[PDB]
Design a protein around this ligand. Structure first.
Ligand code: SF4
Length: 71
């Protein structure tokens, strides 16, 4: 298990960013982050945590990707 990289192809496919504040995408809305995403398994991981859509990786709690969905 290791931190996901923004240039990993899997990351790119979902337009993932470690910092949501840097997202420029039509579906994005300010306030959406991995931290408040249903796929972010450990709601208490405030730094790096697992994500169902990225098996074997840790994503940034302050990040975002196109698969974002409210908890
Ligand atoms: S699916 Fe949710 S928790 Fe996983 S990277 Fe995308 S926004 Fe973050």
């Amino acid at each position: 298990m290791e931190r996901l990289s923004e240039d990993d192809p899997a990351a790119q496919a979902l337009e993932y960013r470690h910092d949501a504040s840097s997202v420029q995408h039509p579906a994005y809305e300010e306030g959406q982050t991995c931290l408040n995403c249903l796929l972010y398994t450990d709601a208490s991981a405030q730094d790096w945590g697992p994500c169902s859509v990225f098996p074997g990786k840790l994503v940034s709690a302050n990040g975002w990707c196109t698969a974002w969905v409210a908890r």
